[PDB]
């Protein structure tokens, strides 16, 4: 099988730092570290992990010895050389068979290569190893499998990494792993004989997308290329006045639920750290928007409805709910885009001898349609009497939320204020304290114009934007042009670089040289992008100046233009065909030859009559 895996691997032909020994820098740990060493009998004992490597953060120790290993997760202090001096709050000791295995054929020449890879995905410490006799005279190029030994859940934070030495009276090959897609070839017996990366070379990527090891001659579409934006531009409106959330959260007479006070918030900058400050929060249920991401969106209008209410009705207050308050006093819309706030208040709604100023309604003719106020004192009819008064079968509509300093949490005077938003396509006026960066044109940038997130290239334009116009679109309803909030000018929006990369190669049994064709893109654009390192493709094919070609199908990189004409072998597009021809061998691009250039000898009185014939047998399938 040719199973394809996506996992943390050591990149092929990557950077590996080779050390020496004769003090022990702490190499950083991230996404796993690949380790290798060659030694005669033994000089490396173990490795030390953790953060800050002191008696304040849980740490690791993988020290080996003659017969076992001494795994533990503890909080050592230091040794500066008996490798620790503290085991105070330390558990999870582990001992098993030794990782190191050394064999010699009656000679010390067999310096077996010991290979190790560790990683800490979702804790669950993984340790993989393999001892190969390839002797270590050079860092070898043969394929070597790596099998796991133990796999144990530390579940701690690891950022730094160190190593241990031995005593005595060329090693430390360290690599770093990265998330890559790998295609591994499994032998008939289950071992892994061969594997190739999918983000190293164009031929490697084709080999990945057509999963196999032999790539037949032709042209293969593999992926797309995109110019990732360089800078991030945020252009918020020209307003700096802080919103009056202070003045709605500093109030002393939050009206009752039967009459929900409704304030409007407009023409201000909304920072919600002031929301957090004046709030021993108890209920931060937000539905339309995530509370953590609240400073980065621009709202056309904000409504602040505030009312004191009992504890359980706080849980009542939510889109699509039921109860005497959610039915007769305050109903939120089912498609509510907003968030609710509730913090306890036993100091302003309570006093000795009690307080009964607050009110609520349990008696209404029908349910309350959403965001409606129903201040009215009409006695609910019972039976069939037009009775107007209090008493039996003649009930007052609104009852009292009497609040005293001594109730349970279910009966305590909770303070509830809701925030109503409207995030649609409209000229926004209220949003976060995010600063307004500069504006740079003719460059791939992520724009955040007045809450309109996106990416692309912007420049000057000659639209005829009417004074109320703010946006721009097309018959397909896609945002085209935006007006600058702090400049009042018109800028168009461009796709980032969208295209598609196709690799032109002969059969791998013939050669490994490849050509790259970027479809439908001017080749100056990719050349400057590859020079600034802003292309999503991580395989950087060489460009020596002689291999560049503006085709009508895009631009070709890796093959040179010969002005001859042949029956071609690999179609490209727009009358251009690439081939693997001798120079001593290279890939060449040439215009198609439609055939042999022939001229007939037509005349007034000339006839050509065949004096002979042949019999040919063709085949049709």
């Amino acid at each position: 099988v040719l199973h394809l895996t996506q996992d943390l691997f050591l990149p092929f032909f990557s950077n590996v730092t080779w050390f020496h020994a004769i003090d022990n820098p702490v190499l950083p740990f991230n996404d796993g570290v690949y380790f290798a060493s060659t030694e005669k009998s033994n000089i490396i004992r173990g490795w030390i992990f953790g953060t800050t490597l002191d008696s304040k953060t849980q740490s690791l120790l993988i020290v080996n010895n003659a017969t076992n290993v001494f795994i533990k997760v503890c909080e050592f202090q230091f040794c500066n050389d008996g490798v620790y001096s503290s085991a105070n709050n330390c558990t999870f000791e582990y001992v098993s068979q030794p990782f190191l295995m050394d064999l010699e054929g009656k000679q010390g020449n067999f310096k077996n290569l010991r290979e190790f890879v560790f990683k800490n995905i979702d804790g669950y410490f993984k340790i993989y190893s393999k001892h190969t006799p390839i002797i270590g005279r050079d860092f070898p190029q043969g394929f070597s499998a790596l099998e796991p030994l133990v796999d144990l859940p530390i579940g701690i934070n690891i950022t730094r990494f160190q190593t241990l030495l031995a005593l005595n009276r060329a090693d430390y090959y360290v690599g770093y792993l990265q998330p890559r897609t790998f295609l591994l070839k499994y032998n008939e017996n289950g071992t892994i004989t061969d594997a190739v990366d999918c983000a190293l070379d164009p031929l490697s990527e084709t080999k990945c997308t057509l999963k196999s090891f032999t790539v037949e001659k032709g042209i293969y579409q593999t992926s797309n290329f995109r110019v990732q934006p360089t800078e991030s531009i945020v252009r918020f409106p020209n307003v700096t006045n802080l919103c009056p959330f202070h003045e709605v959260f500093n109030a002393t007479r939050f009206a009752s639920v039967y009459a929900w006070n409704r304030k409007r918030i407009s023409n201000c900058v909304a920072d919600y750290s002031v929301l957090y400050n004046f709030a021993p929060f108890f209920a931060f249920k937000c539905y339309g928007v995530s509370p953590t991401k609240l400073n980065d969106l621009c709202f056309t209008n904000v409504y602040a409805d505030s009312f004191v209410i009992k504890g359980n009705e706080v849980s009542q207050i939510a889109p699509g709910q039921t109860g005497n308050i959610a039915d007769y006093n305050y109903k939120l819309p089912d498609d509510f885009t907003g968030c609710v706030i509730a913090w306890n208040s036993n100091k302003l709604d309570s006093k000795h001898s009690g307080n009964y100023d607050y009110w609520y309604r349990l008696f209404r003719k029908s349910k309350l349609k959403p965001f409606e106020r129903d201040i009215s004192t009409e006695i609910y009819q019972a039976g069939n009497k037009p009775c107007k008064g209090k008493g039996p079968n003649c009930y007052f509509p609104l009852q009292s939320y009497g609040f005293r300093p001594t109730y349970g949490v279910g009966h305590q005077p909770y303070r509830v204020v809701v925030l109503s938003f409207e995030l649609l396509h409209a000229p926004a006026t209220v949003c976060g304290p995010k600063k307004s960066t500069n504006l740079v044109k003719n460059k791939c940038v992520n724009f955040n114009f007045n809450g309109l997130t996106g990416t692309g290239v912007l420049t000057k334009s000659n639209k005829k934007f009417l004074p109320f116009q703010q946006f721009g679109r097309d018959i397909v309803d896609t945002t085209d042009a935006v007006r600058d909030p702090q400049t009042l000018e018109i800028l168009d929006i461009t796709p980032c670089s969208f295209g598609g990369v196709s690799v032109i190669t002969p059969g791998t049994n013939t050669s490994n040289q490849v050509a790259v064709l970027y479809q439908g893109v001017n080749c100056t654009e990719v050349s400057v992008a590859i020079h600034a390192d802003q292309l999503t493709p991580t395989w950087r094919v060489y460009s020596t100046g002689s291999n560049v070609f503006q085709t009508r199908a895009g631009c070709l990189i890796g093959a040179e233009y010969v002005n001859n004409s042949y029956e071609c072998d690999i179609p490209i597009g727009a009358g251009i065909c690439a081939s693997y021809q001798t120079q001593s061998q290279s890939i060449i691009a040439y215009t198609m030859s439609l055939g042999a250039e022939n001229s007939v000898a037509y005349s007034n009185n000339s006839i050509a009559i065949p004096t002979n014939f042949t019999i040919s047998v063709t085949t049709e399938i």
Binding site: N605, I609, T611, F613, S616, T619
Partner: protein, 177 residues
């Protein structure tokens, strides 16, 4: 494929979840697998229609090329078709078009008609071809010159309407006998 469900194994999910909540994941899995099966069936139907077209073309090619001679150009291979032989192939057929292809040619001369005695002569079948000195009549797809006699050519004309007419004598086997 999980299709957005907790897991992609029915035997696992049924034994892992009690049905009232397991039904959500199961319904997701049906929603995914049904659509995948519909895609497979649609592609198979389209490929079956294409193979129908190819097989009808193969059937008419067999009935024409094999069971007779076809006057259609290039249909039974390139060149003047003569026969064909069918061969069985796995999930297909292979035809062996045997075709007549002309060869080495010589530029001679030609005349639309020959005026013997005030009458234009036209070859009954073939071309009036001249070696260069003595006019002849031969076939079309092969060179086989013959003496211009009154049987190889039919006569109707007035020696004054045809353009490019070349003077020559036509023979008759009747005056001699």
């Amino acid at each position: 494929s999980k299709f957005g469900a907790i897991s992609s194994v029915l035997n696992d999910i049924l034994s892992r979840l009690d049905p009232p909540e397991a039904e959500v994941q199961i319904d997701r899995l049906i929603t995914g697998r049904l659509q995948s099966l519909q895609t497979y069936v649609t592609q198979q139907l389209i490929r079956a229609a294409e193979i129908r077209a190819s097989a009808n073309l193969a059937a008419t090619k067999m009935s024409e090329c094999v069971l007779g001679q076809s006057k259609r150009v290039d249909f039974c291979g390139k060149g003047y078709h003569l026969m064909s032989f069918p061969q069985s192939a796995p999930h297909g057929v292979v035809f062996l078009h045997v075709t007549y292809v002309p060869a080495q040619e010589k530029n001679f001369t030609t005349a639309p008609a020959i005026c013997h005695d005030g009458k234009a002569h036209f070859p009954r079948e073939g071309v009036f071809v001249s070696n260069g000195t003595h006019w002849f009549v031969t076939q079309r797809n092969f060179y086989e010159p013959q003496i211009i006699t009154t049987d190889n050519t039919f006569v109707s004309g007035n020696c004054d309407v045809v353009i490019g007419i070349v003077n020559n004598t036509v023979y008759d086997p009747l005056q001699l006998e």
